[PDB]
Amino acid sequence: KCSLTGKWTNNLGSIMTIRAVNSRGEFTGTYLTAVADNPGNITLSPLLGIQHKRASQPTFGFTVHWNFSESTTVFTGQCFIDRNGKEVLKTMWLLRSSVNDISYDWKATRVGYNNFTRLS
Amino acid sequence: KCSLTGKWTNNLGSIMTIRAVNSRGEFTGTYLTAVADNPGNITLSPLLGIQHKRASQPTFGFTVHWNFSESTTVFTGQCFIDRNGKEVLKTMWLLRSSVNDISYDWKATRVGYNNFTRLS
Amino acid sequence: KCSLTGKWTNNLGSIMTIRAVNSRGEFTGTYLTAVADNPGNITLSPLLGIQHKRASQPTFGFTVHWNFSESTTVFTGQCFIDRNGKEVLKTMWLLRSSVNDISYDWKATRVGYNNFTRLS
Amino acid sequence: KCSLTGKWTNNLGSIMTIRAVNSRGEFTGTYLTAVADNPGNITLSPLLGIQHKRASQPTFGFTVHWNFSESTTVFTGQCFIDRNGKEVLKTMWLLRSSVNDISYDWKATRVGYNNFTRLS
């Protein structure tokens, strides 16, 4: 089985820590991004998400509320377990910027990927 | 101030209810999609997310754990208020499918938009 | 049959003209965006793409080389015809910004939608 | 400088060959995908795109018209040259499926990434 609980790093060097996954698949945690628009402002930020529970290789999503920005990121992906028991989270994300009004909405959403592996 | 608590519909005819937003910006709710890969299977599905609290037009994210599929969707966006006090959630989403192993990961993520308005 | 040759406008107020589609489905055209990072700089910009030829409601893609920015946008979508013969291009786009080096790549891609209808 | 002309492979094993880039930045080529929904049907497929010309690390876009599917992919990205002169294309893509009518449009667009390096 693949549970999101534990510490992970991604290909950009970011670290996240996920706490216990409850029987609904809900989890909370923290996210320390390695990069930001203004990296001098980065602080540890909370995340909240849901994974599927029954599946051995569950899909999941989570939201990161950046504590140093008005932006928000969502990640979604799947936890894969390989033939040696190694786990990888394959994810894609949307990063929503805050803009002043709806005329700027078109430019407010970035997209990308991240691959996560366990810290230990 | 643009509020997320309440009942919403989107341009595809889906509806969602969002409960009280706590001091950390966290909220739960229930999502009824109007469309699915297998629409005969649609059931009500829980959502869990975070919005920014201070901002008048906050960004936010949430995860929908589909209760009838192995897939997961994440939505992110911003709540805008126009001159007459009418709210719109401008959102983008990623829909993650479950695939068998990492070699199929490339085809597992769909993207789209949704605009939500308040029900009555 | 849903045709791409002609003049189109989208939900942001941008317009484009598309020239004759050749036997391989290839087409050129000119794009006038209604919005930009620096809207004072907007100039007409060339587009180049390919549609499917046989299909009545073809999928297609095109690239817009912005003539006033180092960025590039790609659009992909499908041309639909309703019961009355009215056409709509349902599209999604990626907008690539120029960044200084690969360590900034994560923030360089924006995503969004556009719906196009025929001008008159 | 970074010109797209030449042969490239990506992280999925796909190969593309780009021909001469003209003075407008337009280029054509072919794309042999390693993966598809129906890999038994894969055939070499044409691409058409535009890069920026003046920039040492240009952004670009291209469209692949799959010759074995009704789908279309667009790629956009940037060519980076590192301190040793090695080139990498960092890209993201949208893959548009053909659906029967507009009621299915919501599920028709996949998103992903690819990193390309030169074959030789």
Ligand SMILES: O=C(CCCC[C@@H]1SC[C@@H]2NC(=O)N[C@@H]21)Nc1ccc([N+](=O)[O-])cc1
């Ligand atoms: O910088 C931010 C907040 C931090 C985002 C980190 C992103 S989350 C996707 C990716 N994966 C990671 O591990 N880290 C990155 N937001 C922001 C950036 C730029 C602008 N802007 O206006 O340019 C506005 C908000």
Ligand SMILES: O=C(CCCC[C@@H]1SC[C@@H]2NC(=O)N[C@@H]21)Nc1ccc([N+](=O)[O-])cc1
């Ligand atoms: O059908 C599903 C689950 C329901 C997804 C509804 C989407 S969420 C984005 C959009 N906005 C809405 O309000 N509703 C739609 N998932 C799914 C679909 C197709 C496949 N597939 O393999 O084709 C696998 C899983």
Ligand SMILES: O=C(CCCC[C@@H]1SC[C@@H]2NC(=O)N[C@@H]21)Nc1ccc([N+](=O)[O-])cc1
């Ligand atoms: O402004 C630009 C170039 C023009 C892009 C217009 C976009 S194409 C998707 C959408 N549909 C339209 O019809 N028009 C918009 N690029 C740009 C924007 C912002 C930044 N930035 O750094 O913030 C860099 C480059």
Ligand SMILES: O=C(CCCC[C@@H]1SC[C@@H]2NC(=O)N[C@@H]21)Nc1ccc([N+](=O)[O-])cc1
């Ligand atoms: O399979 C296809 C056509 C080939 C797409 C190859 C993609 S392009 C992005 C990525 N990078 C690569 O180098 N290769 C992959 N299209 C398709 C797939 C599935 C469905 N479907 O309905 O499930 C419809 C069309």
